[PDB]
Design an enzyme around this catalytic site. Structure first.
Site, PDB file in Angstrom:
ATOM      1  N   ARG A 214     -52.807  35.490  27.453  1.00 42.63           N
ATOM      2  CA  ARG A 214     -51.582  34.752  27.327  1.00 42.63           C
ATOM      3  C   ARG A 214     -50.422  35.287  28.158  1.00 42.63           C
ATOM      4  NH1 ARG A 214     -49.766  32.558  21.420  1.00 42.63           N
ATOM      5  NH2 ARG A 214     -51.942  31.877  21.866  1.00 42.63           N
ATOM      6  N   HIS A 260     -56.878  24.222  28.284  1.00 40.96           N
ATOM      7  CA  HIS A 260     -55.797  24.973  27.672  1.00 40.96           C
ATOM      8  C   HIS A 260     -55.454  24.389  26.338  1.00 40.96           C
ATOM      9  CE1 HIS A 260     -52.803  28.133  28.044  1.00 40.96           C
ATOM     10  NE2 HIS A 260     -51.866  27.300  27.623  1.00 40.96           N
ATOM     11  N   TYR A 304     -41.835  11.270  34.127  1.00 42.37           N
ATOM     12  CA  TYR A 304     -41.168  10.921  35.383  1.00 42.37           C
ATOM     13  C   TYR A 304     -41.595  11.733  36.597  1.00 42.37           C
ATOM     14  CZ  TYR A 304     -38.098   8.343  32.265  1.00 42.37           C
ATOM     15  OH  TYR A 304     -37.600   7.484  31.330  1.00 42.37           O
TER      16      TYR A 304
HETATM   17 MN   LIG Z   1     -37.245   3.211  33.136  1.00 48.16          MN
END
Ligand SMILES: [Mn+2]
Ligand SMILES: O=c1ccc2ccc(F)c3c2n1C[C@H]3CN1CCC(NCc2cc3c(nn2)OCCO3)CC1
Ligand SMILES: Cc1sc(-c2ccccc2Cl)cc1C(=O)N[C@@H](CN)c1ccccc1
Ligand SMILES: Cc1sc(-c2ccccc2Cl)cc1C(=O)N[C@@H](CN)c1ccccc1
Ligand SMILES: [Mn+2]
Ligand code: NA
Lengths: 671, 672
Positions: A214, A260, A304
């Site tokens: 880790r 993971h 995004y």
């Molecule tokens: Mn949008």
DNA sequence: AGCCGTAG
DNA sequence: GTACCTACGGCT
DNA sequence: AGCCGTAG
DNA sequence: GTACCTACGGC
């Protein structure tokens, strides 16, 4: 209010289950016997009461909810007879964090609710081996395996030696790091339960996992598992620099499912930092979109952004499929993941590392790639090179944020011992602003300092009148002009004095404490500069040697196949007659092997050959490939016959990387 | 959240209003901080046209904007106090960005009209192709949208105040019908901007997208885009019932990248509902792990759950790769997705649907699959069948949650007109509990009723003394016993009386308001029961027709290759020598074609032939395939030649699906 | 009322 | 659409 | 003392 | 690890 109680009001037959979160809680609530079994879901890691102040403990919401649920009160007022459940069951996930949460819960029960354990009211559940977390189980399977009094196996927690148990909670959960570290080093290795034994084993389980899987990087590729998994995920999706960006949510969902088994934010945030040119001296991820700023603005939501490998990351993954490194089974056994990356550049030193483990932590500053490779080359020509000689190639840390380092003495100590204190300063100058007035202009700041926060700090000092002579403070940083922070100085005040004061009282001057700990042979080790470089160079020798061996077997296999094809082309009429005369593939195969002294693989290859291979161009290609191959095999053998030639090949390839990716020093080391 | 600029001089200062923190950080970095301030919003904003003042004033987004502007609001509005002379609306170039823009202009027109009159309000125009402002790098944001040197801003202009008042009222007000009429009337498939025009166009874009691409199911496969994309995502990833469960996080990231550019929680929660057997009458998703409960517990986080198709979902996707349905480009042009699924069972009615759109909503209850298919069969034999006759197959809705429907009269009205109210009652009995005492026991509750919340309502009524006679209330529900909710009744109280009161005053009896709106040829439409069956049967005739045509095309293509292979094997020595003698691939193709009268496709197939195909069992084995194909070709032609034969094939395949997946009715319809 | 279910 | 709680170590 | 970065 | 905003329409 998070508590789902049982209807019975008779504590003697009532059981309360403590689970990690709502994911687990919902399976738990559906599968239980609501008559006698209650569920209280907690919220991940809970307060360690061994390290906390008492008022904090009393004011913590998760702690209160337990106290209210148990009904006994705490400490002096604890009343066993007032308990609302005669069974308090700890049911965390069957994994290393599940174990930690249990040590945290026991610690609370022991320090604050001890009679509860003495009464034999505290138990530990035993969920099956297979599942990700309890959230992954169907309610019915959770019931039968873990909560059914008929088939479940509970461990009752027994308190045997109370002197020993006090010493145990103090050692494991207390605020002295060294004793805990010693306990781990000493024990680290590859229905009634004594509370001391449970704490020792559960804590060691967690602590070990954090150190080796880790928080610490591997010395060979400079990566922690989450980074190595991210980068391997990008390789396996073909997310190369030439290829277009892939959306981040798909990369993260992919890494989560295949390698993971942790929360999405841990993965996405690790990936994001790898894309920040103010965090990584040589960025490993190429991000499209909002990936955060030096002001500590976060990156845009993963829906995004998009990402792919940087060009230098291809150097980390180079030859990974040529048997250079050892693959291992993934967490659930459905996949294979790399134990380490080939790492054709010295990534650990180049990008550095910071991780908080258990019992220990690591802080490694980044370095200039040209200097590091030149250092590796100097070592390759001289195994007995000293640290001082190495420093002739490697001056010190090179931060992506540039700035200044004051002196060589902290660097020298860190390279010699792996621990040193390094003083960093912003790049600042005093200049006229007109009217006889002056300003201080800061164009570079210390590594890992938040710009906006540093400015807030200055403003607060000016506001509290803790610093004198500052008329204005503005951040004039822009994409076009770079970092620019302007401190206006009162007319006739000494700007140099003000600057000196800013160094004393703000992050404008900051130190980097080097603590070079990395995984060497699967164990944490404090290492000096030379040792970190020696481990890197052995790795490169092993990788290149293995690649060369792999390429030799492959070339030999391919040559073998081409010899068979060439034989077929030499006697094509006979080959066609043999196949036509055979009833089945199996007969044709045997007849080709018998008649033409062919191996099974050769015969299979001939039977697979398409008729287009018979055209003039195709026959020549088979012959041209074989001739090219024979030369290649000879070249490979030459490398493997001479260790010096092999080592030279390592030097040559490092050198190529140095020339392609080596850049200028950014950080100025001031004598 | 405001990131202000340096200058104190409003005349030259600009404030940019962005959708979230995703765009905010790129905007912060890319801007000129001397004159450009940034105020990130928090997604959709309050519609002030529908809200009373107390709610408006207490909203944090409205407050931040008021505070930042410095002008105050309404009657106390002061243009001189404005801190920026440019207020710039900068949402994403997508339908939801357009909606946010109408909401912001609505607030500005209602509370800060002089700001618009003064010319201070603008609209930024970021470039398309991005799927989010979070998607753009900071330098791109600056050059295209924030740099005064290259940016194109629209200045909002107020021309006719009477017309604008009316527009804000119609588009954003509380009267749904006028807004619905506006959308119906207008829907269809250089630096100044009139506000009325901006509102009408931005709102229409958003409203239409929600109607045709979000909240309403297709009449043909009964699905909304997100559900269709999830299922297609599962089929594409090969997540069939025979394969093991795939982790939900991975399924969701895949659907997000490839077909659905919206939030992860919208996708994951849609998938979770398809997995819940108390929600879906025939569940489309097979879930492993915590997938939520009837008490409104949500599913476990997607990091823990796994999923795959159910067996019946294979019937939705059956024949999808036989050119039965039209594919379209995905949102970014990098993928193809299905416009509709083949849907071999009547999924619209089987699983029902609920959606809140704009201008309208839909509410279609689930049905018994055996009944629906029988209905479709009856209809296929008689286009003039009536609703009453259809109801001889389809008795009414059949909820996954079972229970009772009272009377057939609301069912009949809903089937005849598409609208009706249907009374659903819990299954409850009265029984003795000992001591001469009784209890009411409830083992089934109405569809979409949160059990825990219904119990809370009962407890509330008892504590407020609004109902007499109840001494205890417990949820004894368990995996072993099923739903069991127990209400103890005071000794000598009339338990039937208490139960009737519970029906009147709690969700123990609830109404399902049927409003059957689905998209028919791309347009929303209120449909009755027969019209929904008719569109479904047509889709099926079309899928089977297209499937048959694809198979026929494919089978002839194959027969053609085999005729070339037959010729090649018959002349094999000459074929090989032809190839050996050719320098290149092209020369061999021309030589084979001229010499053996072979098409370009036959010759390629011959050149692609492996040597192992020259073995003994092949001249006949090729001939074996060729013989079956001719037979098959004939079979396919018969179907295309006679409509009745094609229709019978649809009937037969539906009947097999009914026998394989058809199950018993759960909800009892009591008369009355 | 405040819920239902896809969206920011 | 967004904001915090917790563990863990070392440095200020 | 609060921050650094993977974790619940 | 978790909680609470917004739009939208109908009852
Ligand atoms: Mn949008
Ligand atoms: O802002 C706030 C403020 C408060 C708050 C409280 C409680 C609370 F729960 C939350 C809160 N929030 C946000 C929210 C917490 N978030 C964390 C991240 C989580 N993401 C899931 C996910 C997405 C994936 C994926 N795997 N998992 O795989 C790849 C595709 O995308 C969703 C819940
Ligand atoms: C805490 C652990 S676990 C472990 C171990 C042992 C064997 C197998 C697996 C593992 Cl993980 C070793 C240590 C340790 O402290 N090593 C010492 C070496 N002097 C040290 C001290 C200070 C700094 C770094 C290292
Ligand atoms: C709101 C819209 S958009 C639209 C449309 C038109 C053309 C192209 C694309 C689209 Cl989307 C039609 C309607 C509409 O209201 N249709 C009427 C039936 N005439 C209705 C009335 C009540 C209930 C359902 C349907
Ligand atoms: Mn876990
Ligand atoms: Na009622």
């Amino acid at each position: 209010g998070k508590l789902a109680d049982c209807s019975s009001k008779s504590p003697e037959e009532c059981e309360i289950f403590l689970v990690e979160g709502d994911s687990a809680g919902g399976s738990t609530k559906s599968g239980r016997d609501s008559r006698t079994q209650a569920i209280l879901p907690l919220r991940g890691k809970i307060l360690n009461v061994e390290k906390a102040r008492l008022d904090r403990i009393l004011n913590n919401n998760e702690i209160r909810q337990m106290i209210t649920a148990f009904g006994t009160g705490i400490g002096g007022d604890f009343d066993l007879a007032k308990a609302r459940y005669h069974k308090i069951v700890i049911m965390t996930d069957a994994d290393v964090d599940g174990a930690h949460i249990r040590t945290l819960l026991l610690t609370f029960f022991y320090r604050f609710m001890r009679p509860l354990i003495e009464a034999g009211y505290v138990y530990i559940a035993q969920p099956p081996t297979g599942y990700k977390g309890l959230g992954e189980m169907n309610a019915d399977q959770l019931w039968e395996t873990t909560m059914n009094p008929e088939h479940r196996a509970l461990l009752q927690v027994k308190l045997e030696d109370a002197i020993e148990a006090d010493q145990t909670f103090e050692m494991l959960m207390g605020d002295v790091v060294e004793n805990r570290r010693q306990f781990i080093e000493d024990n680290a290795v590859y229905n009634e339960r004594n509370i001391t034994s449970e704490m020792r084993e559960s804590f060691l389980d967690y602590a070990m996992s954090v150190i080796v899987a880790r928080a610490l990087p591997d010395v060979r590729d400079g990566l922690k598992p989450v980074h190595r998994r991210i980068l391997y995920g990008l390789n396996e999706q073909g997310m190369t620099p030439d290829k277009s960006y892939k959306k981040s949510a798909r990369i993260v969902g992919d890494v989560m499912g295949k390698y993971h088994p942790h929360g999405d934010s841990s993965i996405y945030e690790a990936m994001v930092r790898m894309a920040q040119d103010f965090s990584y001296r040589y960025p490993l991820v190429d991000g499209q979109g909002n990936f955060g700023s030096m002001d500590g603005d976060g990156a845009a939501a993963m829906r995004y952004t998009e990402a792919r490998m940087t060009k230098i990351t291809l150097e980390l993954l180079r030859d990974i499929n040529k048997d250079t490194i050892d693959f291992i089974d993934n967490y659930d056994g459905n996949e294979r993941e790399p134990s380490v990356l080939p790492a054709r550049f010295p990534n650990l030193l180049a990008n550095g590392a910071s991780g908080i483990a258990v019992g220990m932590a690591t802080n490694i500053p980044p370095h200039n790639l040209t200097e590091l490779i030149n250092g590796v080359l100097s070592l390759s020509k001289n195994p007995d090179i000293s640290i001082a000689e190495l420093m002739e190639d490697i001056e010190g840390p090179d931060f992506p944020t540039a700035g200044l380092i004051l002196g060589k003495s902290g660097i020298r100590r860190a390279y010699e011992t792996g621990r040193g204190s390094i003083q960093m300063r912003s790049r600042a100058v005093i200049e006229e602003r007109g009217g006889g007035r002056q300003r201080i202009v800061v164009t570079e700041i210390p590594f890992q300092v938040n710009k906006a926060r540093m400015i807030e700090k200055i403003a607060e000092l000016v506001r509290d009148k803790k610093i004198d002579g500052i008329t204005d403070l503005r951040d004039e940083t822009s994409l076009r002009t770079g970092v620019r922070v302007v401190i206006d100085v009162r007319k006739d005040a000494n700007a140099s004095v003000i600057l000196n004061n800013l160094y004393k009282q703000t992050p404008l001057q900051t130190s980097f404490g080097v603590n070079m700990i990395a995984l060497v042979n699967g164990r944490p080790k404090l290492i000096n500069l030379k040792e970190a470089l020696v481990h890197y160079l052995e790795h490169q020798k092993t990788v290149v040697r293995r690649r060369t061996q792999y390429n030799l077997r492959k070339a030999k296999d391919r040559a073998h196949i081409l010899e068979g094809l060439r034989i077929a082309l030499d006697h094509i009429d006979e080959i066609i007659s043999t196949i036509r005369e055979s009833d089945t593939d199996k007969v044709a195969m045997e007849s080709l092997q018998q008649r033409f002294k062919l191996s099974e693989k050769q015969a299979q290859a001939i039977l697979d050959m398409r008729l287009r291979r018979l055209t003039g161009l195709e026959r020549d290609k088979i012959e041209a490939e074989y001739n090219e191959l024979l030369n290649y095999i000879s070249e490979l053998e030459t490398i493997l016959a001479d260790e010096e030639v092999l080592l030279q090949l390592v030097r040559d390839e490092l050198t190529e990387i140095r020339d392609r990716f080596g850049d200028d020093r950014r950080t100025e080391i001031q004598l």
